[PDB]
């Protein structure tokens, strides 16, 4: 008899989609006609009641030269980059053969489908009820699988004991009439406020220069509900050129824990024609050769937020490039400074990751020297009371390096972990730092989340560290994200149980979920 | 002191947009402050009553290290590919600083635009009434540019007494849900009415396989206007199989000029994953193996379409890999004989072009041999009775392959021209037969279209030969876009005056344009 080959899916279901990826099958009916049923059972602890319907979808064959490549799929089902169609499968590539609404903890999908006289795929598909919890967990088996009146044989590739988690699409493809989001960052204010912000990139999801501007939305129930897209930063046809040479991007958002002042640091381009900043920001401090450093505060919770703040005078050297925030969130450390990891492009042309500090509230700035050379998106974390330590990406490859500062970063000391213990693709990574006595563990960890791998940006993974960051045991991380995207994540503490992150995510271009600090650190 | 430079485009106006480029313009301001105004003049032959407005857009300033490269624009300003968003210019890119409605021919566009101290980009925008004529013709010629109160010496780097012609965006991309068109047919009824076919690609540009009906535009107005689309071959969920994976496509019409039975032949691929029919396609004879070809038929001048015939076991043999109908247009010839290009790879994978005819009006087919190795698309036309003449894309590339049969291809004999009077970048193109009979001319013609180029697919002429295709001169040729583009393009007789074409233009997907026999041979 043929093989009904099972892989489970590891990708956050998210809550408003009407698919979610969960199993896909294949079977290679060379005797096998007619597939009549799949049964499945979730586990003894899955909420029912918070699950709308489960699905069987078929969605035909393979082209013949690609047998034997071990496919699942011959297409991907639920597309996360067309607007406005990004919540359902798309129906041309799968067919909906059985649906079961308000299921129980059985669920039989009787398909009755006639078998191309070849592979053959077919997945199901999991659809959650609209105020279904945050951290609802879902586990499930398929339990048996009738093949011309009979079982037929399964063979799993993937393991077991998986746990699938939801999440909130806070943004789509297509949203608010921008074709795409970008570049997160997360923060928690004092009031348990969720503040998130991203690139709203109108026209395409091309970098600067371009129409972008800086999008934020908030959550005040821990995640579940996020209110009405704002604008914190926005220049549209400033010095009277378009709004595409009038771009704002890359933004990170800290909160002022001494005041709950927000601030959001963002690089507005002007100019540059539509060709990248990277490579159109030009030495000199004036808008019409260079990036400018603008930020944008609140003093209402992130609910408004002020007119934009020219700091570039105060912290660009002239013969510089390009000076700009390190994308995600900055800090406030013990002492009240507050801290943004910033990255400038120096004479040579060559980028270098550092950090810029404000000790009266954020009124004036200042950067000293940078961390490590050819070094450009990064995050700083007080690991120590007085210790910043930098997380960077670095060009050279491989690794992200991290070095430590006792001076705001005058004098900087390599990390023994360095270049050897966080892999990476060359990407965006957030790191943050939880004091025992913001967690239920009482003790202080550092939590940290990217594409973790060395090649591609898939495999999203939280890591924890329970030494200041010197080693990350494989048995405190979560991966959330099986799937290939863009890779960028920031980190918070939802409240002092919990962890949010937002990020890029594959089902998603902002994917929001929640993980229980318990559930990473057992 | 300063230049304007000036640069006329050569494109299609399609009547129904909201926006058209007529000029750009380049200004690098060294020593000026504001441009003020901008005067151009209509020719005196031009009908004012049919433009409904002129409107002159700025677009900011170049990436400074693209200062001196001569380009006139720093980005496209009006997308052909973004659907729901190609009639308008995205006003992201382009500020409107001044607008005349119903102008007369001399117009006074007064911009007030404070100069960025470098490149600077302005360009004027045609927009026609809604009902203007198909053989409108617009010239203009722009009279003074002031420049901080005075006027500034312009240098134009584009030809004198430029022909600017109207068109019809047949099908825009997103109209009706599909993402683009593709692999226009165009031919002319016996009534009189005109029927334009096309790819249907639902999902994206992807060639079959993939989510592809055949559609159809019918005119009845000689292409003024066209009714809502119709779809003489779509098989949706056939075999049980999702519609991406019965997909039809590549179509081509031809008139039965005896009877007016108007015919529609495409190949539809069943199965075969997402990956492309031309590699996807294998021996055989069944929907499981290879491309069906399958027909289509009209009795009523192209108001509805009979269910599909399957003729593939008329004329396929099994050892093909990929027969297929050669895209754009059959021929009744003066016989009788109803004559489709084909194409079959044959089984050493080389393709090769011949025909297939039928001599009972469509009931039966048959293909002898091939005309020449190593070729694709192909049009035929019966240069003199009796006579079929086969212009062929040639994978050698740089010129198209011309052959001639007397028995209905059984034997060939290369033509004179072949692989020499029409260059080609490997490309679809259009071949048609004029009689003297038939047109103002009096005379034998025959009509050409393709990119006349060796690379790229821009610069989309109609060219006109007066000896059965042995040469092509330039002067009876006409370029209508200079624009890139997928380049495929089909042509007609719209009557004995005017010739007519659908093809794939820098401005729409299916553009239609209507050029006088005088104005190409004058």
């Known amino acids: ?19 979610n990826v969960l199993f896909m099958l294949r079977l290679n009916a060379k005797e096998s006609h007619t597939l009549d049923e799949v049964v499945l059972n979730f586990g003894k602890d899955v909420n029912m009641s918070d699950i709308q319907s489960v699905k069987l979808y078929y969605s035909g064959t393979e082209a013949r030269q690609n047998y034997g490549k071990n496919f699942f799929a011959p297409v991907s089902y639920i597309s996360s980059h067309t607007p406005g169609k990004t919540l359902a499968a798309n129906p041309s590539y799968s067919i909906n053969k059985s649906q079961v609404n308000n299921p129980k903890r059985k669920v039989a999908l009787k398909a009755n489908q006639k078998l191309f006289p070849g592979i053959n ?8 009820k609209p105020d279904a919890s945050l951290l609802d967990k879902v586990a499930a088996k398929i339990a048996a699988i009738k093949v011309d009146n009979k079982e037929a044989l399964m063979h799993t590739v993937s393991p077991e004991n998986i746990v699938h988690r939801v999440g909130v699409g806070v943004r789509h493809a297509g949203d608010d009439g921008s ?3 970008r570049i997160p960052g997360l923060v928690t204010t004092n009031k348990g406020t969720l503040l998130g912000v991203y690139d709203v990139r109108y026209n395409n999801s091309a970098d600067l220069q371009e129409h972008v501007d800086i999008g934020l939305s908030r959550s005040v129930d821990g995640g579940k509900t996020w209110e009405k897209m704002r604008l914190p930063l926005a220049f549209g046809e400033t010095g009277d050129l378009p709004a595409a040479q009038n771009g704002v991007g890359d933004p990170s958002i800290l909160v002022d824990t001494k005041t709950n002042t927000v601030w959001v640091v963002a690089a507005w381009t002007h100019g540059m024609g539509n060709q990248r900043a990277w490579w159109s920001s030009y030495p000199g401090m004036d808008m019409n050769h260079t990036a400018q450093l603008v930020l944008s505060k609140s003093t209402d919770d992130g609910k408004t937020w002020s007119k934009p703040i020219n700091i570039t005078e105060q912290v660009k050297d002239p013969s510089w490039y390009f000076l700009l925030q390190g994308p995600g969130r900055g800090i406030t450390m013990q002492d ?4 943004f990891p910033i990255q400038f492009i120096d004479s040579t042309r060559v980028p270098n990751a550092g950090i810029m500090y404000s000790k009266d509230r954020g009124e004036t700035w200042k950067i000293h020297n940078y961390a490590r050379t050819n070094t450009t998106e990064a995050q ?3 690991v120590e009371p007085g210790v910043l330590m930098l997380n960077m990406r670095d060009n050279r490859g491989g690794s992200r390096a991290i070095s430590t500062t006792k001076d705001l970063g005058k004098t900087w000391t390599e990390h023994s972990s360095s270049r050897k213990a966080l892999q990476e693709p060359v ?13 239920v563990l009482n003790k202080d960890i550092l939590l940290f989340s990217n594409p973790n791998t060395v090649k591609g940006r898939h495999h999203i993974t939280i890591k924890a560290s329970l030494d200041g960051g010197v080693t990350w045991l494989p048995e405190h991380q979560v991966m959330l994200d099986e799937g290939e995207g863009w890779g960028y994540s920031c980190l918070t503490m939802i409240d002092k149980e919990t962890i949010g992150i937002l990020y890029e995510s594959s089902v998603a271009h902002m994917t929001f979920q929640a993980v229980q600090l318990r559930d990473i650190i057992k």
Do not use: H
């Open 179 to 181: 074709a795409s989001f």
């Open 427 to 439: 990407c965006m990574a957030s790191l943050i730092s939880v004091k025992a006595k913001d967690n």
């Open 336 to 339: 009240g400074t507050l801290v």
């Open 1 to 19: 008899s043929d093989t009904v080959f099972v892989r489970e899916t590891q990708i956050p279901v998210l809550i408003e989609r009407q698919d």
């Open 121 to 128: 795929y077919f997945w199901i598909s999991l659809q959650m």
């Open 380 to 382: 700083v974390a007080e």
